[PDB]
Structure formats: structure tokens, C-alpha cells
Design an enzyme around this catalytic site. Structure first.
Site, mmCIF file in Angstrom:
data_model
loop_
_atom_site.group_PDB
_atom_site.id
_atom_site.type_symbol
_atom_site.label_atom_id
_atom_site.label_comp_id
_atom_site.label_asym_id
_atom_site.label_seq_id
_atom_site.Cartn_x
_atom_site.Cartn_y
_atom_site.Cartn_z
ATOM 1 N NE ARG B 105 -1.559 0.820 3.968
ATOM 2 C CZ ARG B 105 -2.231 1.302 5.417
ATOM 3 N NH1 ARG B 105 -3.753 1.516 5.740
ATOM 4 N NH2 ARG B 105 -1.345 1.956 6.283
ATOM 5 C CB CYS B 107 -1.257 5.881 3.272
ATOM 6 S SG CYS B 107 -1.982 4.293 3.645
#
Ligand SMILES: [Ca+2]
Ligand SMILES: [Ca+2]
Ligand SMILES: [Mg+2]
Lengths: 127, 127, 127
Positions: B105, B107
Site C-alpha cells: 500500500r 498512502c
């Protein structure tokens, strides 16, 4: 892996290549609205959106693929207040290229872009 | 390549498709927290994180894959100060789907998102 | 798919993994400039840029690949006024790794990054 290079997209002035061909997939660097023949950026957002899209097209075409082979794009903009104009130009670009379908897409407003441009677009195409 | 469509994700009301299936990989468009049945966006970030994740899930499921097939997610948020809440909901969502491992991920806090939403999430899944 | 883990990249303290290996492609999570040996972030942007790049390298190397296999990277920065310094460090890093060519890239200024860092980088590598 093959480096993609074309005089129809802004020259890579730095530690990056315009795009890369992985065989089954092509990835372009983020394209800013610089006119490859002059090194200048048009003042209005409609013109910038079309210029970045044309630049993405040039890089994708350098691999032997077409606009219709684009499956995903990420659009970074400096101001969503211009989103109506950008979407209009964006949709029209794909329509004018007679694509079978529009690609998948992500769009976000960033704090700033290189050369203070209003838009930057990166794309993924498949062979 | 195949176009992905599902009534469980917000209708594509612009020049884009909900997601694309490349055979070995599935790419979703960035999903915003719009309830596909009402077109409304919940007021709080916990509810918005939930709705965006459900939207991503819907697109991935449209290809025949599951939440457990997601390998990479990019989470664009309006505020990293709500990251505690977003991170809680995000982890909970994956835990509820009994995934073997969480995906990779990235972010980042953006300047603004479409429809003034608080989060947008795009995902990559593999078959 | 395979989960990538290395003590040479910051510990995954949350609902995500450091990177994933899909067989023909490796995707890293966004790497922030945390020094895995101390858990601290250097004050200057040059040091942060090199720290994030070293963290990306560590995740890529955990799959068996090398810096030379990186084909695309996305660089998120907190301030484009530091871009001269970031490009300098970025180019130096690839040059020192004797890569055949620089990878494709996208660079944008975001509003905020995890832990208030000045840069975050995610990469795609191919086998
Ligand atoms: Ca039209
Ligand atoms: Ca803002
Ligand atoms: Mg806040």
C-alpha cells in the site's frame, strides 16, 4: 524491457525515460503539458489537458500500440475547479480516437506539479 | 482485455470504466465513497472509508476475484489526521474478509478529491 | 503471489506488507525515509530522498531482483522547491547502481505524507 523514446513527447531532461515497454504492458512516465516542439506550456487548462493527452499518446505510440490499448490512467490536476473542462477534453480525446472503451482512471488534485503545470497524466497500455 | 461493470459500485458517469480485467491482473478505477444505490456520500470519514472499500470490493468481485486477491492499494486521503480512523477501518475491512495477508500500500494526503470526498482508493488484484 | 519482507526496510507497522512479488513483477509499498536501523527520519531532504530510495532497493532486493530491474517509480514530495535536490539524489542513486537506463517516473507534490516526511516513493520492478 525496452526504453521508449519519441520526439513527439517532451524530451526526458533528467533521470527518467519517457516510457517503458515490458512486452505485455507499456508504462509511461507522467506527462506534463509541454509542447514537444517548443518546450513551452499553453496558458489555459483545456489546451494543457489536450497537450498532456497528446504526449501520453506519443509515448504509447512509440511502443507500436495505440490510444485504444490504454487501460488505465492516473490524472493529477492542480485544481478540481477545472475538472469539468478537463473531463470534457479527456472524453473528447478518447472519442476522437474511436476507442472501444474509456480506460479505468483515478483523478486527484495535488498541491503542485513540475513547472507549475495544471495537469500531469501517466498511463498503462497493454499489447 | 475486458471491461468490468457492476451495479454494486457507483455508475461511471464520466469518460471512464469502473475497472479492467487484463487476464492475469485486474485494475480498478479510483473509488470514491459514493453509495451506488443512492448516489450520496456519508458525512464521516469512517463511513466514507467503508464505502470506498466496498466499492473497490465490488469492482474486483465483478472480475470473479475476491478481496483476498488484492495485492496493491493506493489510498488518497483528504486528511492524514484521520489516518487513525482510516487505518482502523482499512485493517478491519481486510480482517473481516479473512485475507492471508494485507496488500502492499501507499498512502498520501492530496489537496482535494472529486466531489470533495475524504478518500479515494484504487486497487490492483491478480488471478 | 508472495509477501516480501526485509529488516533492511522500515517495519510494516499497520495493515500492509512491505512489498509483493507477483512472479513477473514486484510492487513495493510507498517507502518513507525512516532509517530501519534507528527508526529515525533524517532532517534534510537530500538524506530523506536517499533513505527512501535505499528502502525501495531493500524491498526490491528481498524478491531477488536488483535496482536495475526497477521500471517505474512514483515520487511523492511535500515540496517541489526541493525538487532540484531530490532529482540530484535520485539520479545519483541510479548512476551509482550502474543501471542500463533510468526507469519511467511520475513526480507530484502532495499535501502531506505519513510521519510528516518530505518524500515517499513506490516502485514497480520486473523479473
Ligand atoms: Ca463530445
Ligand atoms: Ca485543499
Ligand atoms: Mg485533521
Amino acid at each position: 524491457t525496452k526504453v521508449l523514446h519519441t520526439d513527439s513527447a517532451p524530451a526526458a531532461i533528467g533521470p527518467y525515460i519517457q516510457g517503458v515497454d515490458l512486452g505485455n504492458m507499456v508504462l509511461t512516465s507522467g506527462q506534463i503539458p509541454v509542447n514537444p516542439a517548443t518546450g513551452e506550456v499553453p496558458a489555459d487548462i483545456a489546451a494543457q489537458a489536450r497537450q498532456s493527452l497528446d504526449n501520453v499518446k506519443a509515448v504509447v505510440e512509440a511502443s507500436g500500440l495505440t490510444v485504444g490499448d490504454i487501460v488505465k490512467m492516473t490524472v493529477f490536476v492542480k485544481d478540481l475547479n477545472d475538472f469539468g473542462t478537463v473531463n470534457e477534453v479527456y472524453g473528447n480525446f478518447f472519442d476522437e480516437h474511436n476507442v472501444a472503451h474509456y480506460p479505468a482512471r483515478s483523478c486527484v488534485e495535488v498541491a503542485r506539479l513540475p513547472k507549475d503545470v495544471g495537469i500531469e497524466i501517466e498511463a498503462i497500455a497493454v499489447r
